[PDB]
Scaffold this active site. Structure first.
Site, short mmCIF file in Angstrom:
data_model
loop_
_atom_site.label_atom_id
_atom_site.label_comp_id
_atom_site.label_asym_id
_atom_site.label_seq_id
_atom_site.Cartn_x
_atom_site.Cartn_y
_atom_site.Cartn_z
N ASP A 1 11.51 35.37 -38.84
CA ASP A 1 11.85 36.76 -38.57
C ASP A 1 10.64 37.54 -38.07
O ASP A 1 9.81 37.97 -38.88
CB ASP A 1 12.42 37.41 -39.85
CG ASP A 1 12.79 38.88 -39.66
OD1 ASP A 1 12.87 39.31 -38.50
OD2 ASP A 1 13.03 39.60 -40.68
N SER B 1 9.87 47.92 -22.39
CA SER B 1 10.56 47.37 -21.23
C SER B 1 10.56 48.37 -20.08
O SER B 1 10.62 49.56 -20.29
CB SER B 1 12.00 46.97 -21.59
OG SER B 1 12.73 46.61 -20.44
#
EC number: 3.4.23.22
Length: 330
Positions: free
Chosen positions: A35, A199
């Site tokens: 994770d 992004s």
């Protein structure tokens, strides 16, 4: 040193991925959820409330000659999906794919929430975010990666998640045969303890690319792709019959639909998520309403590049002095 381990979807929807991990002496092998959005290595154990164990493999520290109780240490964690667990702490030898760390904090669960109990395939979590998020008290502990870092050939690990198929976590090296083209690296902020990056925008299907900054985290421990409501609305508008359902808890779509791809930007580069990756199947057994893999982050407080996004790429988690993230197509 290096390590290399196969990671395997837990079910036919890729709801999560498990990776075998050797703990203790002799080895006790547990299947853990790697994770990159948390920083605790915790396991079902011989100490876990018996009614809260249902099919998981447990760690028994009394059977490990290298286990040592970390005196006074406790841990307690709550995850973004509302699940939780807590307990005490041992140090022990932990190996992943041939890579060994001695003195790793192994957090032993005394209590786990129902969602963990109900998932027989996951024996615990192995956190790979920054150690600043580790919940051990009163002395915070380091992640497996943090402990291994100095010994690694290169201070990196890579995630190569499969679509309905196995994949690979590598530690300490970049497998140049595992991706196509070049790896594009992008800046990381560690201010919130996550692999947080920005992004450069998105496209829906064969549509034009929208240049826009989207701050989010690279999180192998989250199933879906969570993005701003504007972006998510633009995606599902291209699917006839799709709608946001309060009762179901997100966007659903007719199971007869063909889903468009979703592209996200990494600098000047582009990662394409095929439409099929965005299908998470009937909302309930036998239903013709299907659950979408792109959902709104509104009210999460953060955008999350979860498995839906990451499994479309070869992803480098670069733990150099100034960390960075790399993405390649594959």
């Amino acid at each position: 040193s290096t390590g290399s381990a196969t990671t395997t979807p837990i079910d036919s929807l890729d709801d999560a991925y498990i990776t075998p991990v050797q703990i203790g002496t002799p080895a006790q092998t547990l299947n853990l959820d790697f994770d990159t959005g948390s920083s605790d290595l915790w396991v079902f154990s011989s100490e876990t409330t018996a009614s809260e164990v249902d099919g998981q493999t447990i760690y028994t520290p009394s059977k490990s000659t290298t286990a040592k109780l970390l005196s006074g240490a406790t841990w307690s964690i709550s995850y973004g999906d509302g699940s939780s667990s807590s307990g005490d702490v041992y140090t022990d030898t932990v190996s992943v794919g041939g890579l060994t760390v001695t003195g790793q904090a192994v957090e032993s669960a005394k209590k786990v929430s129902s969602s963990f109990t109900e998932d027989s395939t996951i024996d615990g979590l192995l956190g790979l975010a920054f150690s600043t998020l580790n919940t051990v008290s009163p002395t915070q502990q380091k992640t497996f990666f943090d402990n291994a870092k100095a010994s690694l050939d290169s201070p990196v690990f890579t995630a190569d998640l499969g679509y309905h198929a196995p994949g690979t976590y590598n530690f300490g090296f970049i497998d140049t045969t595992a991706y196509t083209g070049s790896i594009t690296y992008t800046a990381v902020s560690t201010k919130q303890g996550f692999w947080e990056w920005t992004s450069t925008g998105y496209a829906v299907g064969s549509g034009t690319f929208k240049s826009t900054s989207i701050d989010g985290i690279a999180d192998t421990g989250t199933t879906l792709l969570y993005l701003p409501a504007t972006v998510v609305s633009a995606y599902w508008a291209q699917v006839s019959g799709a709608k946001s359902s309060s009762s179901v808890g997100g966007y659903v779509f007719p199971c007869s639909a063909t889903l468009p791809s979703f592209t996200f930007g990494v600098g000047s580069a582009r990662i394409v998520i095929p439409g099929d990756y965005i299908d998470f199947g009937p909302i309930s057994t036998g239903s013709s309403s299907c659950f979408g893999g792109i959902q709104s982050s509104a009210g999460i407080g953060i955008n999350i590049f979860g498995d839906v996004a990451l499994k479309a790429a070869f992803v480098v988690f670069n733990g150099a002095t100034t960390p960075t993230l790399g993405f390649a197509s594959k």
